[PDB]
């Protein structure tokens, strides 16, 4: 038969399942809703582990339970009372014999030790992957250190000592590859001559590689704490979502730089060379699976100042129009082809973050925090699982690093790019549009001629890599 449980009066996690405290979705069960007590029971269940549940719960729980209260509840979960001796044990003891204690030994082996180990696994994951709770609340960390440091008994000893060390390392807190990265490529600008770096003087292959390293690092730095609760849209977004905002602001700045390079090149022939070079950079972005970079280019080519430059695109070779059109088709029909391509490529990649943000926000906004059943309010956990499915997809693409060498000067050039200068957004985007009208006036105004501005060759070196010995 099943093991008997502690009385629910001394141990709250032994209350029977009912529709008043837990609801399952229609081979482990999937929870639709439940009380916080039932969620924690199933998070640390004696019959099975649910590693995806641990991640989901620790990513999303603050929408229904405070960190201090979570710690109190898992300590309460951990402290399981042992059963009293059975009648057979009693009779042995009355005869001066050692009891078999069969039921006690089974309850230790099959209930207490799995539940306690799974509580410790929650603590381990909490500290390793969600340490910001402790960075932001020193007293929470003290309570966790005291709890872990006072767990007695040899069955848990290896993990108690390990978690203690992990905590101490987190308080005061290297890649290997299948091959060598390719050789850094140079064009007109030579190594160390940062003063000449520009769109046409750096090698287009190396522009795409160094921007991909930068954009990959920015993508990989975004933590789930910046996303849950839609906090990047709220008044404290600069405090709560700084890595996400830095990543988006890089993307915006690069798009505007592409636009500025185009419309400030007033000579038609030179502007064709600029647009052609940006499409070559797009081609290398595609080859590197840097979808953020792909859409930085697509956004620039579809901006109001650039999209209207019919005389410029008239001279772009058909094969380059095909590259740009295929990249733009990724975004059509609510990113249908982008989503399919992202799910088919071989990482590393740099996803476009914007779709994730819209889906997290709409999942939060479009589902209730609680479900009301039989007079009780149950936490709607299915809503949190949906959010954590998105944060988990983000994390899955954050694992794989690019096998590309950093060039420190090119990296610094793109980190310091500031096309807007001291201008405000409206002033600057009106400036770009007025430049577009200057260089290609609205019909029927005649098309003017403008002098060249570049003193170096406009011919591209192309985007196929070279390899000397």
């Amino acid at each position: 038969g099943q093991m008997r449980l502690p009385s629910a009066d001394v141990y709250r996690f032994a209350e029977p399942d009912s529709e008043e405290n837990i609801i399952f979705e229609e081979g482990i069960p999937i929870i639709k809703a439940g009380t916080v007590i039932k969620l924690i029971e199933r998070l640390t269940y004696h019959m099975y582990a649910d590693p995806n549940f641990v991640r989901t719960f620790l990513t999303t729980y603050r929408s229904f339970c405070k960190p201090q209260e979570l710690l109190s509840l898992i300590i309460e979960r951990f402290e399981i009372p042992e059963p009293e001796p059975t009648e057979a044990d009693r009779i042995a003891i009355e005869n001066g014999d050692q009891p078999l204690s069969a039921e006690l030994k089974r309850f230790r082996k099959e209930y207490i030790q799995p539940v306690q180990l799974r509580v410790l696994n929650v603590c381990r994951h909490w500290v390793e992957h969600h340490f910001y709770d402790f960075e932001r609340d020193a007293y929470l960390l003290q309570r966790m250190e005291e709890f872990i440091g006072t767990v007695r008994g040899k069955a848990m000893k290896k993990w108690v000592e390990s978690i203690t060390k992990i905590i101490q390392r987190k308080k005061i807190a290297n890649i290997t590859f299948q091959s060598s990265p390719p050789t850094v490529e140079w064009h007109i600008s030579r190594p160390g001559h940062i003063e000449t770096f520009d769109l046409l003087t750096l090698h287009p292959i190396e522009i795409a590689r160094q921007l991909t390293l930068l954009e990959s690092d920015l993508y990989r730095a975004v933590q789930p704490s910046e996303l849950v609760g839609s906090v990047w849209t709220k008044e404290d977004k600069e405090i709560n979502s700084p890595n996400l905002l830095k990543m988006i602001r890089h993307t915006t700045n690069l798009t505007l730089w592409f636009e500025k390079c185009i419309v400030e090149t007033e000579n038609l022939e030179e502007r064709v060379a600029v647009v052609s070079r940006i499409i070559e950079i797009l081609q290398v972005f595609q080859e590197l699976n840097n979808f953020n970079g792909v859409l930085e280019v697509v956004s620039a080519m579809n901006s109001s100042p650039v999209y209207r430059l019919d005389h410029t695109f008239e001279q772009i070779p058909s094969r380059q129009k095909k590259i740009l059109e295929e990249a733009h088709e990724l975004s059509e029909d609510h990113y249908k082809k982008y989503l399919a391509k992202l799910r088919s490529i071989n990482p590393p990649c740099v996803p476009f973050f914007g779709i994730y943000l819209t889906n997290i926000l709409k999942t939060e906004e479009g589902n209730p925090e609680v479900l009301k059943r039989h007079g009780k309010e149950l936490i709607n956990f299915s809503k949190r699982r949906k959010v954590a499915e998105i944060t988990g997809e983000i994390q899955q693409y954050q694992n794989q690093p690019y096998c590309l060498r950093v060039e420190s000067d090119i990296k610094r050039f793109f980190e310091n790019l500031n096309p807007m200068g001291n201008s405000m957004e409206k002033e600057f985007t009106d400036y770009l549009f007025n430049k577009s009208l200057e260089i290609e006036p609205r019909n029927p105004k005649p098309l003017p001629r403008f002098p060249k501005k570049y003193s170096y060759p406009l011919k591209s070196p192309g985007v196929r890599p070279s390899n000397p010995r």
């Binding site: 993307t251 906004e365 479009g366």
Partner: protein, 167 residues
Amino acid sequence: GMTEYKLVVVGAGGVGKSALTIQLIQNHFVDEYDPTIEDSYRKQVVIDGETCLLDILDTAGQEEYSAMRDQYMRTGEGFLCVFAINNTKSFEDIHQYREQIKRVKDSDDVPMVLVGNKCDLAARTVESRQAQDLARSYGIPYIETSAKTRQGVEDAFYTLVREIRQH
């Protein structure tokens, strides 16, 4: 077959804009949503006896990707310009959204509606007369909506479709 209208929602972030399209497309009578689901933004409706398909683009949450706005906007035939009635800054933003739509569409007469959205119980700071005056100065309709009761939601979208049909 039936006409499809590509509608685009624009407006300040962080003030409940997304509730408009969620409430429209939703199972009206089950408060639930999965935005990842293929065509969670397409809806067949009957407006003045004529059946049509609405395709709604709402990039809510992507407001910081400001250099993508032109591309997103160009996809649209009609626009809902949304502000929150308890956020004066979102109301003051409307002028620049309308100007950007006109530039992107290269037209001084783009089908659009002004939507004042009540996203919570915090005190209203934009009175209906202020928003009516602004809408009249632009020559466009004004609709107020609740983010919680679905009031006004159908009116906002159907009014925009009528603006497209009568363009």
